[PDB]
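User: Good morning. I'm curious how ACV would be positioned relative to this chain. Could you predict the structure with it bound?
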Amino acid sequence: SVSKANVPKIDVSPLFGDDQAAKMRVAQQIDAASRDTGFFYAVNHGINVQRLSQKTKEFHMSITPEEKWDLAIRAYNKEHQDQVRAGYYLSIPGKKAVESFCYLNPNFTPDHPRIQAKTPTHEVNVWPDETKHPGFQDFAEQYYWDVFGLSSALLKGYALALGKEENFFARHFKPDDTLASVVLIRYPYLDPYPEAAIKTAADGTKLSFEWHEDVSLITVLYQSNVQNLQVETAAGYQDIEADDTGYLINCGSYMAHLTNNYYKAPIHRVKWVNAERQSLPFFVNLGYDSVIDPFDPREPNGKSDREPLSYGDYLQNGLVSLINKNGQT
Ligand SMILES: CC(C)[C@@H](NC(=O)[C@H](CS)NC(=O)CCC[C@H](N)C(=O)O)C(=O)O
Ligand SMILES: [Fe+2]
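Assistant: Good morning! Here's the predicted structure, ligand included:
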C-alpha cells in the first residue's frame, strides 16, 4: 500500500560551532535531503522539547470558552478586526476538530514602527490572563527566541548547501522585524469523531488537512509521537515517521522561488488519526521588505530570470491563498 519516506536524522550541532569543515558536512546532508523528499529531522538541537509539550498541553486543556472568544481572531469574532494572524482559532464542536493559538514576534508592540504605520501582516500578540495561565506568556515568548536561534543556525546550513556564505539567508532573519510565527495546534481525540472534520483524498485516504505547499522560507516543526504526515513523490504519497525528540524541517515556497525550484517546496498533507496530539510549527519568515535576488544553482553563472519577490507581498498573498484552498483553520 503506502511506502515510507526516507527522512534522515541530521545532527545540526556543528552549525552552532566554529569547525567549518564539520558545518560543510552538515550542509551536504541538508542538500541531499532537500533534493530527495524535502524533509529531514534536526537532532541534537538543544531545545527542551519536553517542557514545550507540557506547557502547551496545560494551556489547551485549561482554557475556557469565555477566554477563547476573548482571544479569537476576526474569523470567529467580528469585534477583533485587527486580529488576522494572532490569537485563538476555535474548534467547532461536531464540525471542526482542530484548534490552535498563533503568536508573532514579541517585539511587535504599539511602539513598533510597523505597528504605528499599520503595515499588513504585523500585529500585536494577544495573551490570556496571567492569573488564569501563570507563566504561559513567559514560556511562549522564551520559546519563540529559542526556536529563532535554532532556525538561524539551520539557515546557515542551507546557505552553505547552496554554495553561498553562511549569512546569505540569516542576515534577513532579524529579531526586530521577523514575520515568523509559532502555532500551538491541538488535534483532539473525539468519540464519535465528526465526519465534517474528515476530508477524503482523491486516492481514498482520510485526511485532516489537504495537500499544500508551505508559506515560509523554511518550516521548523515539533510534533508529538503520532504518525500523521505524508509527502508527495512522483510514485505517490509516502508516510513520514514520527519522532518526538527531533524537529522536522522542510522548505517553503519562498525557497523554491529564489532557487528556481532547485530546492522544491515539498507538497504534503495530514492524515486523519483519532488521537490526542500536538503540532507546533515555527514558520521562518523574513522581514516585510526583505528581498533576495533569485538564482539558479544549476547554471555556472547562477543566472535566473525570476523576478525578485518582496517577502511582505509574498506572505500576504500566500496566507490568503492557503485559507482559500484548504479552508479557515
Ligand atoms: C502541517 C502542520 C505544520 C500543521 N499545518 C499548518 O500549520 C498549516 C499548513 S503548513 N499552516 C497554516 O495554516 C498557516 C498558518 C499561518 C499562521 N496563522 C500565520 O499567521 O503565520 C498541522 O499540523 O495542521
Ligand atoms: Fe505544511
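The longest helix spans residues 136-161. Residues 1-329 form one domain.
Let me know if you'd like a different ligand tried.
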